[PDB]
């Protein structure tokens, strides 16, 4: 999902922000340890916008 | 006031008197007459040179030359008696001399001839020559760049008194921006040759250091030139657009070689004031991290700085550092933070965390 929305801001470049925010906040509140490299890609792409 | 010929005859009689004085000079009272004769002789030398200069100006369209002088300087010329001209107001003399050399340098004629004439009559020669070279460099691709680099070396040789704004302006007219850059930095360095400004700023700009503050201010005036050049480039970049934008990019990628720590600090201050936080993340500077942490602990409007800090540390992959940064940012009692942005931070926090730290996690 985040890779897609990322590509969306990519094409728009080459709301999306607030949506990405909702996703990252979800990741945070989620009572389940997602994998590590998962969190890595999430944080990095959330930044790169 | 006096056309060249009366001045020539007067200089004839005067240099004759000078010949007499030099010839016979070897031949409480006597020492007194010696002091009076010494004063007479030195005044006579000043007067010979002065009348030579007056004839020199009148032979070169005096009305036009002093017409370029300042209106206040013209009125003062109207109230000046040539006795006060020779004795007291060397300023009007230097100003008329600069006015004539300026008439020549705006007429784009070589300044060497008028320079030799001045040196012979009332010993600004090399200054006039450099002025001519620069002003002509606007009317002259490879050769134009060569003459620009030569004028750059010339004007940086005299970087103490060079009118940085006008020099950089003419360097902006010929798209010779590298000239404005190197001249700004050279004028900064030569102006404060010891770096008192850097010690002042590093000591916290403590108010007692008048000399440190002063040297910092002079470096700031020097840097203001490159600042204005970049600002014009970016403005015309936004209004051509991409051309002046490449001007801005080249100017900044130049200024990024700058090693003056206070200069990096000021550049940061401007850029953040310029709201180019992306370019801020985009250039490598040592003091950013320092200047950041400093301002963040010292501004009392910390929110902006701390957010930028988490960002920059992230771009540098320093996960846990940026982490703690944003962590404090969220915890901070402050009315400018609503619960939403708080929790969104704490999220970004845990996320950078999984990117002792175990304790931080347990706490969070």
Swiss-Prot record, chain A:
This is Nuclear pore complex protein Nup93. It is found in: Nucleus membrane; Nucleus, Nuclear pore complex. Plays a role in the nuclear pore complex (NPC) assembly and/or maintenance. Belongs to the nucleoporin interacting component (NIC) family. The chain holds residues 753 to 819 of 820 of the full protein. The gene is nup93. Coiled coil: none annotated. It comes from the Eukaryota.
């Amino acid at each position: 999902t985040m890779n897609i929305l990322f590509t969306q801001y990519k094409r728009l470049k080459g709301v999306l922000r607030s949506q990405a925010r909702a996703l990252i906040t979800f990741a945070g509140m989620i009572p389940y340890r997602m994998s590590g490299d998962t969190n890595a890609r999430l944080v990095q792409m959330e930044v790169l916008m | 006031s006096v056309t060249p010929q009366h001045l020539e005859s007067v200089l004839k009689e005067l240099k004759g008197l000078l010949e007499f004085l030099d010839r016979y000079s070897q031949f409480e009272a006597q020492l007194a007459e010696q002091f009076s004769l010494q004063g007479i002789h030195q005044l006579v030398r000043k007067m010979c040179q002065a009348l030579a200069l007056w004839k020199l100006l009148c032979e070169h369209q005096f009305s036009l030359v002093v017409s370029d002088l300042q209106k206040e300087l013209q009125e003062q010329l109207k109230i000046t008696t040539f006795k006060d001209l020779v004795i007291r107001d060397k300023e009007l003399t230097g100003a008329l001399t600069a006015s004539l050399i300026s008439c020549y340098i705006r007429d784009n004629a070589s300044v060497d001839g008028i320079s030799y004439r001045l040196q012979e009559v009332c010993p600004d020669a090399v200054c006039s020559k450099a002025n001519e070279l620069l002003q002509r460099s606007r009317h002259v691709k490879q050769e134009k760049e060569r003459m620009l680099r030569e004028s750059l070396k010339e004007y940086q040789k005299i970087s103490q008194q060079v009118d940085l704004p006008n020099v950089c302006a003419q360097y902006r007219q010929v798209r010779f921006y590298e000239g404005v850059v190197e001249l700004c930095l050279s004028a900064a360095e030569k102006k404060d040759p010891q770096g008192l400004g850097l010690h002042f700023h590093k000591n916290g700009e403590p108010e007692e250091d008048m000399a440190g503050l002063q040297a910092f201010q002079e470096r700031l005036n020097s840097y203001k030139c490159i600042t204005d050049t970049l600002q014009e480039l970016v403005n015309q970049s936004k209004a051509s657009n991409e051309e002046a934008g490449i001007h801005f990019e080249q100017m900044l990628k130049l200024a990024q070689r700058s090693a003056d720590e206070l200069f990096n600090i000021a550049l940061f201050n401007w850029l953040i004031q310029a709201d180019l936080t992306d370019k801020l993340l985009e250039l490598n500077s040592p003091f950013l991290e320092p200047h950041l942490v400093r301002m963040a602990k010292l501004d009392q409007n910390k929110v902006r700085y701390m957010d930028l800090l988490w960002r920059y540390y992230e771009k540098n992959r320093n996960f846990s550092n940026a982490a703690r940064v944003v962590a404090k940012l969220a915890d901070m009692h402050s009315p400018e933070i609503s619960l939403k942005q708080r929790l969104e931070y704490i999220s970004r926090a845990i996320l950078s965390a999984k990117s002792a730290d175990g304790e931080f996690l347990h706490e969070l």
